[PDB]
Design an enzyme around this catalytic site. Structure first.
Site, PDB file in Angstrom:
ATOM      1  N   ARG A 178     -46.004  95.639   4.683  1.00 34.89           N
ATOM      2  CA  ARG A 178     -45.366  94.610   5.496  1.00 34.89           C
ATOM      3  C   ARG A 178     -44.247  95.155   6.370  1.00 34.89           C
ATOM      4  O   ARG A 178     -43.654  96.186   6.059  1.00 34.89           O
ATOM      5  CB  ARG A 178     -44.845  93.483   4.608  1.00 34.89           C
ATOM      6  CG  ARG A 178     -45.962  92.760   3.901  1.00 34.89           C
ATOM      7  CD  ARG A 178     -45.499  91.479   3.242  1.00 34.89           C
ATOM      8  NE  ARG A 178     -46.630  90.870   2.543  1.00 34.89           N
ATOM      9  CZ  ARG A 178     -47.021  91.189   1.314  1.00 34.89           C
ATOM     10  NH1 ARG A 178     -46.359  92.088   0.610  1.00 34.89           N
ATOM     11  NH2 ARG A 178     -48.081  90.599   0.801  1.00 34.89           N
ATOM     12  N   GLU A 184     -42.521  84.786  -3.237  1.00 34.39           N
ATOM     13  CA  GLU A 184     -42.135  83.862  -2.174  1.00 34.39           C
ATOM     14  C   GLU A 184     -40.637  83.968  -1.923  1.00 34.39           C
ATOM     15  O   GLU A 184     -39.853  83.925  -2.867  1.00 34.39           O
ATOM     16  CB  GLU A 184     -42.471  82.428  -2.583  1.00 34.39           C
ATOM     17  CG  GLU A 184     -43.853  82.197  -3.154  1.00 34.39           C
ATOM     18  CD  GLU A 184     -44.987  82.278  -2.144  1.00 34.39           C
ATOM     19  OE1 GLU A 184     -44.729  82.286  -0.935  1.00 34.39           O
ATOM     20  OE2 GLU A 184     -46.157  82.301  -2.611  1.00 34.39           O
ATOM     21  N   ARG A 220     -56.809  90.029  12.373  1.00 37.15           N
ATOM     22  CA  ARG A 220     -57.901  90.957  12.192  1.00 37.15           C
ATOM     23  C   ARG A 220     -59.134  90.225  11.702  1.00 37.15           C
ATOM     24  O   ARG A 220     -59.071  89.037  11.320  1.00 37.15           O
ATOM     25  CB  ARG A 220     -57.496  92.062  11.225  1.00 37.15           C
ATOM     26  CG  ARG A 220     -57.220  91.609   9.818  1.00 37.15           C
ATOM     27  CD  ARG A 220     -57.265  92.820   8.888  1.00 37.15           C
ATOM     28  NE  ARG A 220     -56.919  92.518   7.505  1.00 37.15           N
ATOM     29  CZ  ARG A 220     -57.704  91.858   6.660  1.00 37.15           C
ATOM     30  NH1 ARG A 220     -58.883  91.385   7.058  1.00 37.15           N
ATOM     31  NH2 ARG A 220     -57.299  91.651   5.413  1.00 37.15           N
TER      32      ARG A 220
END
Ligand code: NA
Ligand code: NA
EC number: 4.8.1.8
Lengths: 352, 352
Positions: free
Chosen positions: B161, B224, B98
């Site tokens: 997500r 992470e 984007r």
């Protein structure tokens, strides 16, 4: 109890204002300690592999200014890097470190009342404490303790790392080695080393491998540790401690560390080796972690809007500023590979 | 068999010479792919949060020069960051990403023979593939695959997500979602995603938390990942894969990755979050790791005197240069927070 978990160890990061005075050049690999409202600073490295000076710098937290302590008595004879310094009562104790010419600092005290240095012990003598650099130090009421580090090279040996602790009984003026934890315990430099609620904790650090199966990286098997051990002077026993948590920190060395009550509090550190040993900065962390030594759980901590940047090879200690115990971080190297003169304090708010 | 262990995956890091031509401005968060002896490059981010251009850049590995592919056909209508591009046969496929104004790129092919773009699919329509940015992509003989990434925000939702894979059947010109791996599987952006010996591997990446007990860091639970899953198209089954090794890499995202035979080969990546999301670089790795997908063992690899510095948010792919298969790394951000135009190739020497 809310559904979403707030962090347990709460506090505030502060950048300590340094107004001026006889301010020390930026440095890493040095020693600091606090007595009363004064921070003392000795030794250091900058540029890489070069020592700097042998002045004893003094920062007053009330005035926020630096001065140089009177260089009276047996002034330490070598300007060193990889040194450490602790405070017990009104005396500072400096042990080890070396210069580029491989001369190691012996063991000295500085009396902050009388303002004088005293030479206490020649290192590397038969039956005495060895010369060490990149060792760690801590202390309690009547002892100075030295853990790990790298030895002095001689004709028939290259430098090696230690897994032992040397303990100096201040009242008796005598050194003794504590029980050796044995082969399963990593020989390490720049490890965490603290007295916490009466026991000695050794944690993480930069380890020598004891397994030819570990492959070399940049030509050496040396690696970052994540292991934790505790020694109880009351029983003279070693134990390996299994620590837990989703936020258990990845392997690292060369980090700020301090004990506050039941907490071991760390910040920063080398998390990846540099290809050229200490020439470049490797990869340095910008994160803080704390271990509850009672529950054995690690968690990150945060301290508000002030966030110290990635750094390692700092000097650190515990002190109290404005009635808050916490972790004091001074100097070190940054990911630019520059040394810094910055000083940060993580002030603890919660119970310990 | 020697006593001391040499590394298993052997190869050489090379810096790819770029002689000149119509050279692309430095960028991260972009897509690259190779067809024959040509590398194609599209999209990118620099400065932070800003897209750059919509040219299709072409690097010839024989001439070591850049050119711009003819902008014929349905030229992609948006200059995007967080995009990816794969090659199948003589066509490139660009999906998503984007701009700062939250306009997402649709799905396009570029025919490298006829030198023209074709608009293939409008994203975010009912029953079709969603708009995504910071997703991962891979491909096989007759499919383009999209995994994970971050959705488009609308009135009644903030971006979230994905944990799903969208698969485009090239011959049929049809999209389908693969079986959803379910709640125990992390929704992630910038994850590793590769076809390896016929199966799809999803590994590590930047995860949404599914546990209010995970505390926030910098105001978000995002963290992470170090998890690894495999999807077999032959059976349509997901499995979580337990991977091992002393040198299993710490949690990370945004890394170079490629498949060479049985190996998943990675380099670099974000190992610590930035306090300000993507504004600063956080902490980036300078290390390479490989996973043997047959033995499930991770080991670091080294490649001689050329050692790429810390970087993440690179574009990466597999290719062959001078008869050696390997991992190609292009662009990204450095610990200075600058973008780079550097290109590196890890050429594999050992069997795969
Ligand atoms: Na005072
Ligand atoms: Na060719």
């Amino acid at each position: 109890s809310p559904e979403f978990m707030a962090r347990t160890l709460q506090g505030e990061w502060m950048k300590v204002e340094q107004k001026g005075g006889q301010v020390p050049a930026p440095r890493s690999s040095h020693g600091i300690a606090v007595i009363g409202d004064k921070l003392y600073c000795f030794g250091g490295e900058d540029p890489p592999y070069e020592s700097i000076d042998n002045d004893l710098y003094v920062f007053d937290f009330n005035t926020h200014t630096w001065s140089i302590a009177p260089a009276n008595g047996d002034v330490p004879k070598t300007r060193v890097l990889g040194t450490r310094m602790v405070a017990v009562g009104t005396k500072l104790y400096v042990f080890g470190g070396r210069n580029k010419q491989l001369e190691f600092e012996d063991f000295y005290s500085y009396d902050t009342v009388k303002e004088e240095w005293k030479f206490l012990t020649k290192l590397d003598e038969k039956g005495g404490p060895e010369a060490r650099t990149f060792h760690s130090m801590t202390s309690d009421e009547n002892h100075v303790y030295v853990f790990g580090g790298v030895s002095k090279g001689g004709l028939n040996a290259t430098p090696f790392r230690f897994r032992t602790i040397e303990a100096y009984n201040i009242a008796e003026g005598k050194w003794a080695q504590l029980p050796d934890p044995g082969e399963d315990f990593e020989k390490r430099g720049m490890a965490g080393f603290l007295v916490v609620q009466g026991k000695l904790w050794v944690f993480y650090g930069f380890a020598t491998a004891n397994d030819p199966k570990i492959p070399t990286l940049y030509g050496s098997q040396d690696y970052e540790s994540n292991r934790v051990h505790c020694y109880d002077p009351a029983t003279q026993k070693w134990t390996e401690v299994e620590t837990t948590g989703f936020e258990k920190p990845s392997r690292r060395s060369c980090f700020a560390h301090a004990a506050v009550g039941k907490y071991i509090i760390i910040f920063g550190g080398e998390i990846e080796r540099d290809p050229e040993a200490h020439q470049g900065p490797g990869t340095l962390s910008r994160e803080g972690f704390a271990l509850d030594t009672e529950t054995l759980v690690w968690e990150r901590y945060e301290g508000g809007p002030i966030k110290p940047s990635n750094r390692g090879w700092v000097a650190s200690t515990t002190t109290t500023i404005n009635g808050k115990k916490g972790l004091l971080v001074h100097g070190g190297k940054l990911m630019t590979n520059e040394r810094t003169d910055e000083m940060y304090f993580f002030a603890v708010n919660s119970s310990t």
